Design a protein around this ligand. Structure first.
Ligand SMILES: [Br-]
Ligand SMILES: [Br-]
Ligand SMILES: [Br-]
Ligand SMILES: [Br-]
Ligand SMILES: [Br-]
Ligand SMILES: [Br-]
Ligand SMILES: [Br-]
Ligand SMILES: [Br-]
Ligand code: NA
Ligand SMILES: [Xe]
Length: 240
C-alpha cells in the first residue's frame, strides 16, 4: 500500500497474509480475506506458481510476534475456471483457498462480509485498501498492515480512455487513482473494504496496477468485483 497509514491491529480482522515457503522460512506474497473458518478468498494470480502456501490470520507485523497469529496450511486451491494468467485484464482474478484447519475466531480473526450479488458502488464511494504490499513503487513490503483511503472510480470513468480504457471490465472495481495512494505488489488478493449502510464489506480483491507503477494518476488500483462472484464463491464452498 503506497501512501497508507498503519492499521490499528484490530481494525481489519478478516485480512490474511498469504505466504509461500522459501527454504527454511516463509515469505509474504499476497493478501486475502478470510470468508469461512476454513476458507480464504484471494486473487488467482497469487496462486499461479506451484508453491507451498500458508495463510496467517491475526497477523499485524510480518516480522514480529504479535501474540495473535494463527498459521495454517493451504490444503486445496480453487482458481476461477475462466482465469488466464497472461490476461489479467480479462478478469476472473479470484481464487478460494481451503485451509487445512479451521481457524479460531476472536477480535483479531473474523470472517469478512461480502456484498450482495450484483451490488455496484456509486462513484467515489469510501473504501480502504489494506495490505502489506510495497509502500512505494519498486519499494519494499510493509512490516505492519497498512490501510489507504481509496474512493471508488466507477466503471464509466475508469474504463474511459484517460484511465484504463478497455483494460478494465465491469467485473472489476477501480479505486484511487490520485497519484499518491494505491495498492502495490504484495497487496494482490487482499481486500477493498467499502463502507455500505454503515457496515464495511469486502467489495474488491486486489488484482492489478499500472505497469508504470503503483500510484499513477488516473490509473486507479483495480480489484476483482466480489459482488460479481457470489454464486461462484457459494458454489465452490458448497462443493468442497
Ligand atoms: Br475486516
Ligand atoms: Br464458517
Ligand atoms: Br490444490
Ligand atoms: Br480443524
Ligand atoms: Br451489499
Ligand atoms: Br463496484
Ligand atoms: Br454482477
Ligand atoms: Br454472482
Ligand atoms: Na506477526
Ligand atoms: Xe497490485
Amino acid at each position: 500500500v503506497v501512501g497508507g497509514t498503519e492499521a490499528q491491529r484490530n481494525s481489519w480482522p478478516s485480512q490474511i497474509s498469504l505466504q509461500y515457503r522459501s527454504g527454511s522460512s516463509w515469505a509474504h506474497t499476497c493478501g486475502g480475506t478470510l470468508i469461512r473458518q476454513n476458507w480464504v478468498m484471494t486473487a488467482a494470480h497469487c496462486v499461479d506458481r506451484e508453491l507451498t502456501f500458508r495463510v496467517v490470520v491475526g497477523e499485524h507485523n510480518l516480522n514480529q510476534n504479535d501474540g495473535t497469529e494463527q498459521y495454517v496450511g493451504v490444503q486445496k486451491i480453487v482458481v476461477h475456471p475462466y482465469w488466464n494468467t497472461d490476461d489479467v485484464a480479462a478478469g476472473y482474478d479470484i481464487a478460494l483457498l481451503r485451509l487445512a484447519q479451521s481457524v479460531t475466531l476472536n477480535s483479531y480473526v473474523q470472517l469478512g462480509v461480502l456484498p450482495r450479488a450484483g451490488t455496484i458502488l456509486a462513484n467515489n464511494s469510501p473504501c480502504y485498501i489494506t495490505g502489506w504490499g510495497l509502500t512505494r513503487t519498486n519499494g519494499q513490503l510493509a512490516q505492519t498492515l497498512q490501510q489507504a483511503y481509496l474512493p471508488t472510480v466507477d466503471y464509466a470513468i475508469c474504463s474511459s480512455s484517460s484511465y484504463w480504457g478497455s483494460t478494465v471490465k465491469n467485473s472489476m472495481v477501480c479505486a484511487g487513482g490520485d497519484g499518491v495512494r494505491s495498492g502495490c505488489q504484495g497487496d494482490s488478493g487482499g481486500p477493498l473494504h467499502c463502507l455500505v449502510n454503515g457496515q464495511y464489506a469486502v467489495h474488491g480483491v486486489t488484482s492489478f496496477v499500472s505497469r508504470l507503477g503503483c500510484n499513477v494518476t488516473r490509473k486507479p488500483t483495480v480489484f476483482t468485483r466480489v459482488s460479481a462472484y457470489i454464486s461462484w464463491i457459494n458454489n465452490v464452498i458448497a462443493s468442497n
